[PDB]
């Protein structure tokens, strides 16, 4: 598998500045809509990143609601371990 990557976010006045988006039916929580100039952007989060851990807890087998709770639980910073999306395909 692709080497996961650690992103360490510092909570700003309007939160982190990203959407957490699920699939409906099949598991997996993905980052979307990383807002320009946000803490998420500055921490290196990318749209299409698959979220593997929140503060060192694997969240691959957690519901959307549980993952949101884990991110919101953190007082002023959150560590997110992600797997970045593929950028090269041969056709
Ligand atoms: Cl991905």
From Swiss-Prot:
Tissue expr: Detected in liver, kidney, pancreas, prostate, spleen, small intestine and placenta, in particular in the syncytiotrophoblast.
Residue positions where Phosphoserine is found in the record: 38
Modified how: Phosphorylated on serine residues.
Regulation: induction: By estrogen.
Ranges of residues in domain PDZ: 6-86
Subcellular location: Cytoplasm; Apical cell membrane; Endomembrane system; Cell projection, Filopodium
Function: Scaffold protein that connects plasma membrane proteins with members of the ezrin/moesin/radixin family and thereby helps to link them to the actin cytoskeleton and to regulate their surface expression. Necessary for recycling of internalized ADRB2. Was first known to play a role in the regulation of the activity and subcellular location of SLC9A3. Necessary for cAMP-mediated phosphorylation and inhibition of SLC9A3. May enhance Wnt signaling. May participate in HTR4 targeting to microvilli. Involved in the regulation of phosphate reabsorption in the renal proximal tubules.
Reported disease: Nephrolithiasis/osteoporosis, hypophosphatemic, 2: A disease characterized by decreased renal phosphate absorption, renal phosphate wasting, hypophosphatemia, hyperphosphaturia, hypercalciuria, nephrolithiasis and osteoporosis.
Subunit field text: Homodimer, and heterodimer with NHERF2. Binds the N-termini of EZR, RDX and MSN. Binds the C-termini of PDGFRA, PDGFRB, ADRB2, NOS2 and CFTR. Binds ARHGAP17, EPI64, RACK1, OPRK1, GNAQ, CTNNB1 and PLCB3. Binds PDZK1. Interacts with CLCN3. Binds the C-terminus of PAG1. In resting T-cells, part of a PAG1-NHERF1-MSN complex which is disrupted upon TCR activation. Forms a complex with CFTR and SLC4A7. Forms a complex with SLC4A7 and ATP6V1B1. Interacts with TRPC4 (via the PDZ-binding domain). Directly interacts with HTR4.
Name of this protein: Na(+)/H(+) exchange regulatory cofactor NHE-RF1
Shown residues within the full chain: 11 to 94 of 358
């Amino acid at each position: 598998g692709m080497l996961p990557r650690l992103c360490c976010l510092e909570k700003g006045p309007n939160g982190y500045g990203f959407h957490l988006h699920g699939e409906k039916g099949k598991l997996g929580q993905y980052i979307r809509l990383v807002e320009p100039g946000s803490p998420a952007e500055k921490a290196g989060l990318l749209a299409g990143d698959r979220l593997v851990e929140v503060n060192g807890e694997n969240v691959e087998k957690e519901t959307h609601q549980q993952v949101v709770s884990r991110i919101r639980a953190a007082l002023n910073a959150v560590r997110l371990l992600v797997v970045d999306p593929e950028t090269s395909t041969t056709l």
